[model samples]
Target: TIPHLAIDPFSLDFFDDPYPDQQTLRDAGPVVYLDKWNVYGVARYAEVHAVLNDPTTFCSSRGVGLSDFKKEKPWRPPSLILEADPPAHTRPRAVLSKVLSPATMKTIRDGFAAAADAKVDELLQRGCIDAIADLAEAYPLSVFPDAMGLKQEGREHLLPYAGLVFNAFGPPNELRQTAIERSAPHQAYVNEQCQRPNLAPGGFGACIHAFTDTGEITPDEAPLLVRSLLSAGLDTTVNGIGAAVYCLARFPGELQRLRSDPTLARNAFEEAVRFESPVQTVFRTTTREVELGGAVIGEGEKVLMFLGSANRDPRRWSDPDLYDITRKTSGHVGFGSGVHMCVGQLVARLEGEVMLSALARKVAAIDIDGPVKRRFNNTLRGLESLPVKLTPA
Candidate 1:
């Protein structure tokens, strides 16, 4: 029998300080059945990693959320890649893979780096700023929209839309409900921006639309494919940057280490991700009755993968909770795993690398100036405000 717990992972209280509950879930067993949500959860590193790898058995098609698409209407059309299984997932995945390929990323790296430098210069002028509003959120909103060739006017919609989409992956509680209510106009803006005529010629949006002409995906599918980028892009990076800043602010020694070797910027960002996973949980449904952690989970049952917990599992990391910049964090599930791993992670890392590199070169130290405010979302771990005073090197 699986260990059973009645904790509601989606509750705001749980969202506030999840580590205690995450520890509880992990210690209960490899697989813990949440009586409140009626979902089986895997908090241990090994099982969570294994389940992510074997998507054939633990599928994403039914819906990667508490609600099953087979039984109820999805709030929006299911994601072309995220909510799909193999054969259907294949073409879109191929198209996105090409669109965000290392080669394609190379084309934009210098430009992205330049933008990061410029943003960092601007932030330094302020001396003290809310890292979330000023640097974390501002940096991504500045570059990613233009990269997608979106119009400047309604670009504000991106974050809210992403917040809604990520929040909806959990239970339909007040947080999800509020996100739904707030996202309507933003959703309309996103739908409008995904159209071919609205996309600029050289951006990723146009690149996705180009796949339609190659017969890889249908014309109808092009917009949704662009929608995928718009949906997944900003918030993850914003939270990621927030996590990095928070980590460095709290760990002055690590920040000093980064300042000494600026090239470690990428590793710092990745370690911060492993330390404070931005995308905390992702769901997959069982394709059929399957044995996990010596317990059988029925077909169509929801299995919540605690990515935040998995990243810090002592079984995987030597000093699991320490925010060490030198740690080898390659296998960390902060970006999820397997075929469904975050396709936009490279872009996120680039954003992180450039920004953090700029800070390493120019800023001697970052110290918390005021109370740090945590932003609660069902699926994301991030901040609403992180006040910090920067000392220029």
Candidate 2:
């Protein structure tokens, strides 16, 4: 018999503050039945890693969200990259990977670095600021759309659109309800932006579309591939930056480590991702019945993999609770793992590195100045407002 737990992972309370309960669940056992949602949940690192790494067995095609695509109608067209199985997933992933190649990212790097410096200068001038509104969201809102070749107008829809995209990953609750109510316009704008004609020349959007000419992907498939960009664009990196800043402000020693050697900026972001684990949990469906750590799981079961818990699993890290910038965090699942590893991760890393580097060079110290407000989401964890005073260097 499985250990039945009354945890509601979809509850607002869980969204507001998830760590303690996530730890409790992780420590419960390798395979606990979540009675609240009727799903098999795995919170330990090894189990979660296994599920993600073995994608074909624990499949995504049934849906990465709570709703199984095999049983219910998907809210939208399934993501070719996210929802697709290997046969359909294969080429689009290759196209996206090639489109997001090192050379393409390199061309965008200097501009992003300059943007980071300029934003830092403005924040330094303001002295006291809401790091989320001012730095975290503000930075990505400006830079990422341009990187993806989006039109200059209606960009306000980026975060809202992403809110719907990630929220749809969880059980339909108040969070998903509200997001759905506000999503139509944002979704329309995102759809329009994905079209090749609307995109700027030589940007990632265009690069993805160019594959259509070579028969690598179809003209009809190009915008869908591009739509994946906006779905991932602002919210993820925004929260990631927010998490890194929150970690640094709280852990000044690590911040000092970053200041001493700005190169540590990259590692600081990676460790923060491991510590905070922004995208907390993701669902995978079992294609066939299988036993996980002695617990039996049936076909088409939506198994929730607790990324936040896995990242902090004590078995995975000696002192999993502590946030250390210098730790080896290569195998962490903050962005999911395996072939479905975050396709847009390099862009996030590049932004995180540049922003932290700029802060290390320009800011003397970062200290929390006022109450921090949490922005609750189905899949994301981040601050809505983090008031902080930056002492200029």
Candidate 3:
């Protein structure tokens, strides 16, 4: 039996911004069953962390999106690691994890940081810019494709198209339709770029193909894994960058602290992720009858973990809503909690810290001059545009 006041997870209001729903759900209990979908929802910080980290008990094999992998036909095949659990998830993750190791990441950091600094300098010289499109969108577009070894021609389309596909993981409606329509034309080019022998050297994509050559992952499985990187990787960072800028603009003094020491970039980025998490409300399936916060969640039910709400849950922090860069916030699940945590998080942070710190160094202060427009995606929290002015440092 489910609760009477339960809200539809797929509703437009929920998709637009879910904090209100998050608050309601959290208040209801640690876990509430939505009769509408027969799925459980975890809103409070502790339970959300429990479910995310305990993947063995709360399986991801059902797929992290709303649809269960066992039932739905995925547009692309399942990722070997992200969509698999433990023993089954081990090999492919090990191979790719080695490829994305800290040493390899260190080699690319200086080059990416240099590029970010150059872009920030250019944006500051212009005096004012849309932080979303100009800086947030620009940095990832410049860095990630090269990291993935993709050709430059069709890269600009990556952000919007990928944003739509992620949103489609939820209910089908105007928002989902809009994303599909916007992304329809770019499908071919994206597919073309995913093919083997088309990718450049020193990218994760090529390394996946190399694993295939060495009989590590099947030939059939390699490209789909690379496709996961292409599909899941881009727009989330764009949103993250935008959210970081948005938070700093709203909270004035924090930007000054960040500028004083560029190393604060990591803390600032983490705080931004903690404040306005880029991805919100990822779904999970109950592997068995699970009891959470005294509620019995039946077997094989879907559970929506409201990450945005959990991040802002007053129970979790002194002042959860405030954006304090100096907050000791390492345990927050913005990148997620356990084994299925974001694989490319360092890349996301590096891109954000480089671009944001560069902007801070060049500008004394940045503030929004107009309304902030949000882009609706059931799975992601992102901005459509953030209008702003940068005062020279």
Candidate 4:
């Protein structure tokens, strides 16, 4: 029998600062039953990694949220890739994989890097600014839309739609409700932008539609696949860059180290991901009766994997709480793991590397200048406002 805990992981209180709850869950056991949500949770690194890798046994097809699609209608259309299993998932995944491959990424890398430099140069002129709004949000919003070849009109819808997608993964609480209300219009706009005629030539959106020529995916599937890119692209990178900014602001020594060696920018972003874990938790369901960490979970049981906890599990990392760029973070689950691992991570990494490296080249030091408020979402962890004063190099 799994040990039971009465805590609600999706509550606002938990999202505010989850480290304490994360510690409690990790210490409780490898697999603990959350009586509040009627679900089992795995907080240990090894078990969480195993669950993500063994998606065949712990399938994603039923749904990756608390409300299983098999039992209830989804709030919106289910993601063809994220919510699908092998054969159904194969073709779509292949199309996206090729579309976002390293070679494909290289084509955009210089453009993204130039955009980051321009953004950083403009922001540094202000000296003091909200890193979240000014740098993190502004940077991704500027480049990603253009990369996708989305029209300038109604491009603001991206963030809200992403927020809703991530929040919907949790139980239908107030957070989820608010996101749904705010994101409806944004969702409509995103859907409209996915159509073939709406996209610009020679961009990711156009490239996705182009796959129809090879018969890799259907014309109907093309839009939804583009929708997936929109869903996953912006907010993740925003939070990722925000996490790096927040980590560096809180740890000045690390910031100084970054200034000294600009080459460490990518490592810094990765370390911050492990440190702050932008996507805190993702839910997986058991396909059948299966034993994990000495406990058996029945078929169709929802197992919420505490990704943030697993990244910081002391058993897996030495001084896991410390945000050190020097630490190895290759195995971190920040972008998830296995066949369902984040397809957009390469783009996210490129964005982070460009922005951080650009900032390092321009800023002498970065320090917190005002109150830092956390934006609580059901799934994503990032700052709502981070005021910082930057000394120009």
Candidate 1, residue 117: how far the Cα is off, in Å: 1.1
Query: lDDT by residue for model 3 over 57-105, one digit each (tens)?
Result: 7898888777787777765567677778988887777667766778778
Q: Each model's TM-score, in the order given? A: 0.98, 0.98, 0.94, 0.98
lDDT of 2 at 255: 85
Q: Locate the minimum summed-lDDT window of 10 residues in model 3.
A: 1-10
Task: List the lowest-lDDT window of 10 residues for candidate 4.
Answer: 178-187
Q: Over all chains combined, what TM-score does candidate 3 have?
A: 0.94
Clash pairs, model 4 backbone: none
Q: Which scores higher on lDDT, 1 or 3?
A: 1
For 83-152, candidate 2 gives per-residue lDDT tens digits of 9888788889989988888887789999999999999999998999999999999999878888888888
The candidate with the higher TM-score, 3 or 4, is 4
Worst 10 residues of 1 by lDDT: 207-216
lDDT string for model 1 (193-224, tens) is: 99999999989999998888776798899999
User: What does the lDDT read for residue 8 in candidate 2?
Assistant: 92
Instruction: State the C-alpha lDDT per candidate.
Output: 0.91, 0.89, 0.80, 0.91
